[PDB]
Design a protein around this motif. Structure first.
Motif, PDB file in Angstrom:
ATOM      1  N   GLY A   1       0.817  -1.208   0.000  1.00  0.00           N
ATOM      2  CA  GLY A   1       0.000   0.000   0.000  1.00  0.00           C
ATOM      3  C   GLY A   1       0.844   1.249   0.000  1.00  0.00           C
ATOM      4  O   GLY A   1       0.914   1.968  -1.007  1.00  0.00           O
ATOM      5  N   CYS A   2       1.491   1.520   1.104  1.00  0.00           N
ATOM      6  CA  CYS A   2       2.325   2.679   1.234  1.00  0.00           C
ATOM      7  C   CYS A   2       3.555   2.354   2.067  1.00  0.00           C
ATOM      8  O   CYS A   2       3.539   2.453   3.294  1.00  0.00           O
ATOM      9  CB  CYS A   2       1.565   3.836   1.886  1.00  0.00           C
ATOM     10  N   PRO A   6       5.656   7.635   4.444  1.00  0.00           N
ATOM     11  CA  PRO A   6       5.594   7.344   5.871  1.00  0.00           C
ATOM     12  C   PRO A   6       4.281   7.790   6.502  1.00  0.00           C
ATOM     13  O   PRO A   6       3.851   7.240   7.503  1.00  0.00           O
ATOM     14  CB  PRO A   6       6.769   8.129   6.458  1.00  0.00           C
ATOM     15  N   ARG A   7       3.620   8.749   5.888  1.00  0.00           N
ATOM     16  CA  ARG A   7       2.380   9.256   6.416  1.00  0.00           C
ATOM     17  C   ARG A   7       1.287   8.258   6.197  1.00  0.00           C
ATOM     18  O   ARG A   7       0.615   7.857   7.138  1.00  0.00           O
ATOM     19  CB  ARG A   7       2.028  10.589   5.802  1.00  0.00           C
ATOM     20  N   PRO A  13      -1.113   1.173  10.235  1.00  0.00           N
ATOM     21  CA  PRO A  13      -0.050   0.433  10.930  1.00  0.00           C
ATOM     22  C   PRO A  13      -0.065  -1.069  10.653  1.00  0.00           C
ATOM     23  O   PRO A  13       0.962  -1.740  10.761  1.00  0.00           O
ATOM     24  CB  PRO A  13      -0.341   0.684  12.419  1.00  0.00           C
ATOM     25  N   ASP A  14      -1.206  -1.590  10.272  1.00  0.00           N
ATOM     26  CA  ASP A  14      -1.354  -3.029  10.078  1.00  0.00           C
ATOM     27  C   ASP A  14      -0.789  -3.471   8.751  1.00  0.00           C
ATOM     28  O   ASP A  14      -0.538  -4.657   8.539  1.00  0.00           O
ATOM     29  CB  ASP A  14      -2.819  -3.473  10.187  1.00  0.00           C
TER      30      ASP A  14
END
Length: 16
Positions: A1-2, A6-7, A13-14
């Motif tokens: 995903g990303c 970092p944002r 978080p998962d």
């Protein structure tokens, strides 16, 4: 995903 943004990364978080 990303993993590079970092944002987006910290928003989900998962996942990366």
């Amino acid at each position: 995903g990303c993993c590079s943004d970092p944002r987006c990364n910290m928003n989900n978080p998962d996942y990366c």
